[PDB]
Design an enzyme around this catalytic site. Structure first.
Site, PDB file in Angstrom:
ATOM      1  N   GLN A  55       4.414  56.440  13.507  1.00  0.00           N
ATOM      2  CA  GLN A  55       3.144  56.758  13.770  1.00  0.00           C
ATOM      3  C   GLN A  55       2.388  55.857  14.755  1.00  0.00           C
ATOM      4  O   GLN A  55       2.669  54.598  14.965  1.00  0.00           O
ATOM      5  CB  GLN A  55       2.217  56.463  12.499  1.00  0.00           C
ATOM      6  CG  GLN A  55       2.292  55.081  11.871  1.00  0.00           C
ATOM      7  CD  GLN A  55       1.484  55.081  10.561  1.00  0.00           C
ATOM      8  OE1 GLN A  55       1.268  55.906   9.688  1.00  0.00           O
ATOM      9  NE2 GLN A  55       0.951  53.745  10.263  1.00  0.00           N
TER      10      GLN A  55
ATOM     11  N   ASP B 183       5.912  53.472  31.288  1.00  0.00           N
ATOM     12  CA  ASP B 183       5.909  52.847  29.956  1.00  0.00           C
ATOM     13  C   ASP B 183       7.297  52.566  29.173  1.00  0.00           C
ATOM     14  O   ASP B 183       7.197  53.336  28.114  1.00  0.00           O
ATOM     15  CB  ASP B 183       4.881  53.554  29.012  1.00  0.00           C
ATOM     16  CG  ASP B 183       4.269  52.543  28.041  1.00  0.00           C
ATOM     17  OD1 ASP B 183       4.987  51.693  27.399  1.00  0.00           O
ATOM     18  OD2 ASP B 183       2.927  52.528  27.839  1.00  0.00           O
TER      19      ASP B 183
END
Ligand SMILES: CC(C)c1ccc2oc3nc(N)c(-c4nnn[nH]4)cc3c(=O)c2c1
EC number: 2.7.11.1
Length: 609
Positions: A17, A132
């Site tokens: 999540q 990233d």
């Protein structure tokens, strides 16, 4: 428990999540094939989005997870994405295991660097900015041949950000590889980059430009630096030597003197294209790994050994499968024999070498507090289980060293005996020659040259005879019972019969089971009254397993390893003195082998028409 045209997933199968979409464990409805569904509830802002995702469907590569299709959820009409399910987890998942608490295994680190760089190269070939890169954004699947396959998954976290940001592409890759190498992050304030956020930026910017690690040891304290991997890192020095430069020069904020991608992909491929040759310095009791290209020669191979153990080339005498190696300076590295950790090439030097053995970092271990803090107990259990797992890794390395010394010494004695027998062969070659010149001179018999030559041959047999006495005494050493016998080597140490490694790993398996359960207690927040009980008793059992395993590691291992190593120094000294004597006596069998014939081909043959 949402559904779609195809596929369906349960809401309790949530694996990750975060921002925007979560990831569930879905199926295919028509088939039971597993999938990873990205839900995307926050469909904020804005055709073009489905196109920039449609290109992600076609792009297929071994080191990227594949986007199979995009669909619309039944009830909520949310843009859901089906992706390749990776049952092993992410790179952060394997870095959570105590076996990788101090770094990934050497082979699996090569799997990471191979798949990671290969995936980013394929993305840059198509121009897909990732930037990233994170262990969480690097998944792991099991290949068709076991092994492992790492795949990028999220493209198009403050701990892995370049100094110019942190509120430029190769920075995250350097921090991940360092994290994968030593099992810990570089650039750390006191206990995480939390409230010491301003301290973290002071570490990231203003770097010695050659170091790789920064760490403070106390609150608002000083920062230590290093341009090398730590001693605790379980990665061969043969790999750190060529892995340090790429890290120390991609973690430099100065974009003027920082590697580009073309140079990054060049130096990394140079690392991956190499092969490993296992070499165990017998005189120093140190195992090594020579990373050398398959097209290199043996001369550079001896240079790489000098770079690790400081042994001079051409003085490096190599042993393998009980025989001497006798390598040639032109042979390619791909023609070398096979090499494993349990079958490495042994190395002597005929010169006195300092025996140091293996160097490992003492941990002294952490304490357990009677506080019931669950997250504290979870973070504590993770560190202490990685410690005892480090002791198992050290214990297996010390056992391998002892058994390898036993094999190298057992071979070395049978190698000295062969050279001893070759000296005896040249001795009797001089004996029969000395006999056939004595009995020929005494057969033919002014006459001054007769007695002169006769007494000179008496001088030959006088020195040759005392050579025989010195040789038979050398064999009296090589004989059982006497000096230089490999009898102590079968004692004074540890053996796979004692099963010390397994005695520690049974307590390691009890620990990692408690730790895995403690991490489950973190998710459950408060526990039941009975579950609070068992969490307390197993917390105390963690301390009992630590005290018992660590005591068995320091009193059985290490202590016996120190005795076997201290006695190895004595046997090495006596072995160098033995080989020095036998070589000198072998040289004495060569010059007097030339003194004969000189006193036989000539001086006995006269002339007459
Ligand atoms: C052990 C748990 C934590 C676990 C197991 C299997 C997993 O398998 C995944 N397979 C994927 N394809 C994606 C993904 N992330 N972004 N896009 N796909 C994520 C995961 C997991 O987190 C995961 C966790």
């Amino acid at each position: 428990m949402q559904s779609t045209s195809n596929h369906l997933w349960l809401l309790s199968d949530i694996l990750g999540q975060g921002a925007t979409a979560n990831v569930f464990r879905g199926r295919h409805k028509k088939t039971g094939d597993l999938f990873a569904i990205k839900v995307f509830n926050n469909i904020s802002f804005l055709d073009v989005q489905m196109r920039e995702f449609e290109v992600l469907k076609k792009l297929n590569h071994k080191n990227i997870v594949k986007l199979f299709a995009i669909e619309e959820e039944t009830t909520t009409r949310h843009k859901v994405l089906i992706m390749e399910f990776c049952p092993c987890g992410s790179l952060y998942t394997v870095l959570e295991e105590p076996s990788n608490a101090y770094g990934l295994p050497e082979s699996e680190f090569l799997i990471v660097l191979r798949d990671v760089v290969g995936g980013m190269n394929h993305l840059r070939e198509n121009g897909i900015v990732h930037r990233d890169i994170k262990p969480g954004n690097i998944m792991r699947v099991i290949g068709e041949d076991g092994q492992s396959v790492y795949k990028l998954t999220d493209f198009g976290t403050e701990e892995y950000l370049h100094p110019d940001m942190y509120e430029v592409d190769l920075w995250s890759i350097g921090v991940t590889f360092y994290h994968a190498a030593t099992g810990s992050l570089p650039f750390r304030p006191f206990e995480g980059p939390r409230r010491n956020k301003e301290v973290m930026y002071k570490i990231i910017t203003g770097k010695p430009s050659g170091a790789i690690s920064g760490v403070q040891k106390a609150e608002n304290g000083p920062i230590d630096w290093s341009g090398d991997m730590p001693v605790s890192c379980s990665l061969s020095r043969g790999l750190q030597v060529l892995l340090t430069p790429v890290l120390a020069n991609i973690l430099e904020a100065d974009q003027e003197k920082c590697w580009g991608f073309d140079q990054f992909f060049a130096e990394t491929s140079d690392i991956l294209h190499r092969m490993v040759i296992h070499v165990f310095s017998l005189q120093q009791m140190t195992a090594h790994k020579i990373y050398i290209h398959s097209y290199n020669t043996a001369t550079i191979f001896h240079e790489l050994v000098y770079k690790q153990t400081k042994i001079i080339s051409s003085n490096q005498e190599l042993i393998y499968e009980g025989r001497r190696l006798v390598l040639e300076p032109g042979r390619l590295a791909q023609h070398f024999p096979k090499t494993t950790e349990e079958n490495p090439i042994f190395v002597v030097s005929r010169e006195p070498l300092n025996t140091i053995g293996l160097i490992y970092e003492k941990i002294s271990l952490p304490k357990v507090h009677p506080r019931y803090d669950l997250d504290g107990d979870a973070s504590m259990a993770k560190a202490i289980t990685g410690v005892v797992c480090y002791a198992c890794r050290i214990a297996s390395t010390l056992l391998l060293y002892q058994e390898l010394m036993r094999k190298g010494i057992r071979w070395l004695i049978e190698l000295i005996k062969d050279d001893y027998n070759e000296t005896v062969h040249k001795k009797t070659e001089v004996v029969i020659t000395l006999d056939f010149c004595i009995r020929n001179i005494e057969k033919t018999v002014e006459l001054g040259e007769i007695s002169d030559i006769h007494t000179k041959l008496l001088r030959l047999s006088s020195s040759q005879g005392t050579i025989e006495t010195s040789l038979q005494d050398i064999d009296s050493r090589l004989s059982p019972g006497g000096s230089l016998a490999d009898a102590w080597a079968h004692q004074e140490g540890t053996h796979p019969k004692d099963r010390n490694v397994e005695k520690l790993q049974v307590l390691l398996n009890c620990m990692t089971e408690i730790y895995y359960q403690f991490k489950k207690d973190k998710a459950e927040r408060r526990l039941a009254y009975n579950e609070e009980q068992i969490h307390k008793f197993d917390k105390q059992k963690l301390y009992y397993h630590a005290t018992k395993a660590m005591t068995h590691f320091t009193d059985e291992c290490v202590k016996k390893y120190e005795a076997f190593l201290n006695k190895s120094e004595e046997w090495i000294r006596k072995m160098l003195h033995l080989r020095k004597q036998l070589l000198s006596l072998t040289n004495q069998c060569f010059d007097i082998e030339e003194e004969v014939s000189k006193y036989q081909e000539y001086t006995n043959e006269l002339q007459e028409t």
